[PDB]
Structures are given as structure tokens and as C-alpha cells.
Structure 1
Amino acid sequence: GWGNHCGLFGKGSIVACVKAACEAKKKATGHVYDANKIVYTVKVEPHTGD
């Protein structure tokens, strides 16, 4: 309206935007396994009396 420098009193269009990024070290990342690349490690130790 006149109070904010418009000729008419009514609804005026307004649009606001912000650039959105992510804070450093504030991510949550997911990882998936490939059954063909997964490794199983097995250890064996003899009973040596020690």
C-alpha cells in the first residue's frame, strides 16, 4: 500500500531465495556391499604349550 510505496493497497508478489549447501563434515553417507568383493578373514593358531 502507500505505507510501503505502492500506488494501490493490495497483494503484491514477493519471492525469497537462499543458496543451500551442507556444513563441512555434516553428511550421512550410505555404502552397499558387493557379495563378490566382500572378504572373510580366518585365523588359525596351533596349541604349542605356550
Structure 2
Amino acid sequence: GWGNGCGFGKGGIVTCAMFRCKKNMEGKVVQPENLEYTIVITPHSGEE
């Protein structure tokens, strides 16, 4: 309206702010394949 520079009624307004992520989390998908098993094969000798 007149109080803020217009010749009264609703006007269009838009506001933007830069968004900066500071801490995120991530979810991953584990495929049955590409899984890696570690196996130890030890000789039963009794050595010390």
C-alpha cells in the first residue's frame, strides 16, 4: 500500500537464502556380493 511504496492489496514477495549443510548422514546399500569374508587357516602343530 501507500505506506510501503505502492499505488492497497496483496502483492507478490519472494525470499531466498543460501543453504549450507554443516553435518550430514548417508545410507548405503550392501550387496550380498562384494561382501568380503576373512578366514584364517592355522596348522594344528602345537609349535610355540
TM range, smaller chain: 0.5 to 0.7
**Letter paired with 1:32:** V
Shift of 1:41: 2.1
Report sequence identity in percent: 42
TM-score by length of 1: 0.60
Any stretches of 5+ residues in structure 2 without a counterpart?
Answer: none
RMSD after superposition:
2.2
Question: What's the CA shift for 1:44?
Answer: 5.5
Map of 1:22 onto structure 2: 21
* Structure 1 stretches of 4+ moved >6 Å: none
Between the two proteins, the alignment pairs up a number of residues equal to 47
Deviations 1:2-27 (A, max 9, x none): 111211x111111111222311xx11
Unmatched tracts of structure 1, length 5 or more: none
- Identify the residue that residue 34 of structure 2 maps to in structure 1: 37
